[PDB]
Amino acid sequence: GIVEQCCTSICSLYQLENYCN
Amino acid sequence: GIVEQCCTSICSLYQLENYCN
Amino acid sequence: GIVEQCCTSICSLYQLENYCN
Amino acid sequence: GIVEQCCTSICSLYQLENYCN
Amino acid sequence: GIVEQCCTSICSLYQLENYCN
Amino acid sequence: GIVEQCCTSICSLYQLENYCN
Amino acid sequence: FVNQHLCGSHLVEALYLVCGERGFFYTKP
Amino acid sequence: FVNQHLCGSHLVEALYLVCGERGFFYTKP
Amino acid sequence: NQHLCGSHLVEALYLVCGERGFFYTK
Amino acid sequence: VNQHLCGSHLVEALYLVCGERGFFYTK
Amino acid sequence: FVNQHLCGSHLVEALYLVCGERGFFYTKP
Amino acid sequence: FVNQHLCGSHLVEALYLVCGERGFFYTKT
Numbered sequence: 001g002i003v004e005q006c007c008t009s010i011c012s013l014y015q016l017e018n019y020c021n
Numbered sequence: 022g023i024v025e026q027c028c029t030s031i032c033s034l035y036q037l038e039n040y041c042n
Numbered sequence: 043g044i045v046e047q048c049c050t051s052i053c054s055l056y057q058l059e060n061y062c063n
Numbered sequence: 064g065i066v067e068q069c070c071t072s073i074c075s076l077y078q079l080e081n082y083c084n
Numbered sequence: 085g086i087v088e089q090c091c092t093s094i095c096s097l098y099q100l101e102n103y104c105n
Numbered sequence: 106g107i108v109e110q111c112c113t114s115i116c117s118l119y120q121l122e123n124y125c126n
Numbered sequence: 127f128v129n130q131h132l133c134g135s136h137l138v139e140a141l142y143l144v145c146g147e148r149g150f151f152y153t154k155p
Numbered sequence: 156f157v158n159q160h161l162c163g164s165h166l167v168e169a170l171y172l173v174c175g176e177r178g179f180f181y182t183k184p
Numbered sequence: 185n186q187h188l189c190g191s192h193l194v195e196a197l198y199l200v201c202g203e204r205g206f207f208y209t210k
Numbered sequence: 211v212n213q214h215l216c217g218s219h220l221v222e223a224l225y226l227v228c229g230e231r232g233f234f235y236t237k
Numbered sequence: 238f239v240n241q242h243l244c245g246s247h248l249v250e251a252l253y254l255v256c257g258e259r260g261f262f263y264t265k266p
Numbered sequence: 267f268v269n270q271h272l273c274g275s276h277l278v279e280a281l282y283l284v285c286g287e288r289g290f291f292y293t294k295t
């Protein structure tokens with residue numbers, strides 16, 4: 001999930017865009 | 022939608038729970 | 043109080059409600 | 064209270080301090 | 085920097101003021 | 106200023122980036 | 127509308143707290 | 156401890172939403 | 185908003201009041 | 211509680227990044 | 238006024254996110 | 267680190283309130 005991927009190391013804006021509809 | 026119901030009026034957490042998955 | 047109980051482990055909204063007036 | 068006083072006009076840090084315990 | 089001085093031990097509003105313009 | 110440009114009509118992240126150092 | 131835009135920011139924080147494990151789909155009107 | 160300080164700020168924002176009209180009382184041991 | 189303004193006020197009071205804390209009522 | 215606090219910050223960031231599309235938050 | 242203050246609160250948050258390592262300089266109008 | 271990113275998010279929020287009209291310059295090497 002986003003917590004397992006983005007709370008262990010910082011996610012770039014590109015990686016965050018993975019969760020957009 | 023949620024904006025029309027909760028931005029023009031105060032929505033409790035009970036009312037917001039109807040928008041959860 | 044709320045710090046030792048809800049910052050060491052996740053509190054339900056029902057648990058947080060105990061801290062309400 | 065603080066809402067009538069600080070949402071109608073800006074409150075300085077000192078004015079907000081009036082609402083501390 | 086502010087992260088080094090305030091991200092382990094708490095900085096009071098007064099110490100944070102040192103970082104204003 | 107950023108307030109004049111973004112506090113009435115929405116500024117996307119792309120417009121906001123123009124305010125970065 | 128900026129007021130609408132900022133209100134949504136506050137709505138997603140609230141949905142995060144109330145929805146817990148269920149999560150939620152946020153879409154915009 | 157900054158971890159406790161930042162968690163506390165997350166707790167007051169949640170109490171604001173959970174307590175609604177009742178309000179709440181926050182004080183640090 | 186008064187409700188969202190209040191959300192910001194509680195965050196500000198948490199910072200300003202330090203160990204004293206505050207009492208919040210609607 | 212680290213996961214919970216981090217997730218609270220992630221949803222705020224997803225709200226800005228996703229703009230008009232919105233997003234899906236799930237655990 | 239208060240609406241501009243609330244707006245600013247959200248803008249600094251967004252600048253923190255998009256500006257990354259570069260940072261940003263903020264001053265009230 | 268994630269903790270540093272989270273701490274900085276809170277710090278910018280705190281500087282926005284404390285600095286008022288003066289404002290601040292936020293940078294993160």
Ligand SMILES: Cc1cccc(O)c1
Pocket residue numbers: 005006007009010011216219220223254268271
């Ligand atoms: C990795 C991460 C966590 C929290 C917020 C972010 O923007 C990014």
Ligand SMILES: Cc1cccc(O)c1
Pocket residue numbers: 026027028030031032033133136137140172187
């Ligand atoms: C009505 C409303 C708006 C934003 C957040 C909330 O919890 C409730």
Ligand SMILES: Cc1cccc(O)c1
Pocket residue numbers: 047048049051052053054143162165166169211214
């Ligand atoms: C346990 C916990 C801490 C902080 C905020 C919450 O909603 C819950």
Ligand SMILES: Cc1cccc(O)c1
Pocket residue numbers: 034035038055056059144173
């Ligand atoms: C689900 C929910 C909403 C509001 C208050 C509570 O204690 C619980």
Ligand SMILES: Cc1cccc(O)c1
Pocket residue numbers: 068069070072073074075079189192193196239242283
């Ligand atoms: C007057 C006011 C409103 C909201 C937040 C503040 O710090 C001050």
Ligand SMILES: Cc1cccc(O)c1
Pocket residue numbers: 090091092093094095096157160199273276277280
């Ligand atoms: C020490 C510290 C860290 C983050 C935010 C604060 O208000 C204070």
Ligand SMILES: Cc1cccc(O)c1
Pocket residue numbers: 111112113114115116117128131226244247248251
């Ligand atoms: C236009 C606007 C105002 C405030 C915050 C934002 O992310 C965008």
Ligand SMILES: [Cl-]
Pocket residue numbers: 161162215216272273
């Ligand atoms: Cl945090």
Ligand SMILES: [Cl-]
Pocket residue numbers: 132133188189243244
């Ligand atoms: Cl707002």
Ligand SMILES: [Zn+2]
Pocket residue numbers: 161165215219272276
């Ligand atoms: Zn946080």
Ligand SMILES: [Zn+2]
Pocket residue numbers: 132136188192243246247
């Ligand atoms: Zn707001």
